[PDB]
Amino acid sequence: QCVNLTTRTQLPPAYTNSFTRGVYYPDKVFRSSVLHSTQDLFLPFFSNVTWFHAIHKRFDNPVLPFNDGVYFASTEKSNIIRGWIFGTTLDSKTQSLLIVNNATNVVIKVCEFQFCNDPFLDVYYHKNNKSWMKSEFRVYSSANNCTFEYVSQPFLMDLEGKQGNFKNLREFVFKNIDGYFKIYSKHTPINLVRDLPQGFSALEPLVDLPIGINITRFQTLLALHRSSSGWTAGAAAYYVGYLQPRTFLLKYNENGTITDAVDC
Amino acid sequence: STIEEQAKTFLDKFNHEAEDLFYQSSLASWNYNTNITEENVQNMNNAGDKWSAFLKEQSTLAQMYPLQEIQNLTVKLQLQALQQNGSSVLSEDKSKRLNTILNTMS
Amino acid sequence: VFNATRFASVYAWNRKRISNCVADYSVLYNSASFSTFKCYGVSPTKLNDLCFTNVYADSFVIRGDEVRQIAPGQTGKIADYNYKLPDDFTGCVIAWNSNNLDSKVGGNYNYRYRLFRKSNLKPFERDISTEIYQAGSTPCNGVQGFNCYFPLQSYGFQPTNGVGYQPYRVVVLSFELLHAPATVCGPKKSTNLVKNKCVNFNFNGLTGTGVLTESNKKFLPFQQFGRDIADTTDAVRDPQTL
Incomplete structure (x- = not known):
């Protein structure tokens, strides 16, 4: 912690x-x-x-x-990224949003959290019986005052460490307006070494969360593992950027999807 | 601060504790009169003694609230009956021998 | 909530937070399963048409004659020293006779109450403190004695007790509209559908007049409504059926 x-x-x-x-x-x-x-x-x-x-x-x-x-924009192999944590103080001082992926379901809660210097979900003692499942939870010791809760559907995500080029690309958009926190998600496989692939992408809506709180700051939740100074992580890369009020011209095909977009 | 507040407090908690023991004492006598059994005859004595000793225990604390400092009429009337010690004022022998005379004559 | 086997004591009353769902109040009013039902500030028929952000359902058991003390700006032992309703309380009250469940032979002391308190409880305040009550200035120190009493008292419960004192399970719903968005709303309608005819249709928050005809177009699963180059919707997706 x-x-x-x-x-x-x-x-x-x-x-x-x-x-x-x-x-x-x-x-x-x-x-x-x-x-x-x-x-x-x-x-x-x-x-x-x-x-x-x-x-x-x-x-x-x-x-x-x-x-x-x-x-x-996240390039993932072993799915190191479990989610993100949003809020003003990112601590019990106010209500903070926390998106965690345990490899089973995505737990989304808005509560008062005890902030740790280095939050993460650890996995210990691989060796035989390769495991790779949620074991140690270092994010916060205790929490209370929960104004919101959400849980996604069960799924099996592979945490096993992988090598080579990045085989997955996950691009998200996160925004909060009128207390409504909206998420736009896209997931496609790629073959890449570093940076990003060159091409067009159109994100789709995932969930609209009426969390009703102000978010001035964020922190990424990453997964660590070892077989809390001795933890390790696999190869993973993600990117961050700030949205501006820009006007785009979006072209739609006969199927309704965006063919291309031009910034005015 | 005044004895009036303390007297009304003792009277409020007395009605609740006395209503539970008094109801069970009278209920025991009902099952004894409606049905004659070895269980009802004992329940009437246990429930009767539990309620009889209740007033004796409350009477000790009732004499500690003089009625001279109570300006409420409804308060003094409630404590007027509790102020009486019943057979407690009688001597140990005269107190126990009294019940023997009443039970012998009856 | 009212079907729960055991309910908390008047001092132990549990507060349940209900949000993010739909509420149907017509089943509770037309079920005839309640002894007394009354509301304050809001009518029962209007609850179905109103959306509330937070709904708190209070649970506890009190004496029959003690139910009359539950209301905005009330008094009495249970109201001041146990549970009180603010003058602005917009919720409703529900009670029914528990003598067939709670009350048992020999009496049930599991349900108690706070008889004495140094003052009156504030609106929507719950104090479970068992500290001995001091009537006068004589020190207590947790030891019962002269001018020292135990505030909690048990409700006598037996089936032979009078109907007036029979225990009644009360469920108090607190309706509070805050600045947060509204979620809980009344039930829906979803009447029959008609096609190939001139009619006035209202779908969710959209209204208009036109002829409903099924076409071969396919809207994105996430996209409910369509629009033309004129920003006029030429087709819509059934909010219920796909």
């Missing part, structure tokens, strides 16, 4: 470029074979995003300002 890992080596937050990222279905209105122009919180095209990486010598788990909206 309060003990940071030894292998962690602080390195500068390198920046990378995102081309078409930030496009998503604005609402549930069906539109096809039309070019629609809208303005909402978006990621400008050809903008700069920050390079984050999680591994046993660079492991990045900083707290970061949420502002109006933030964009996430």
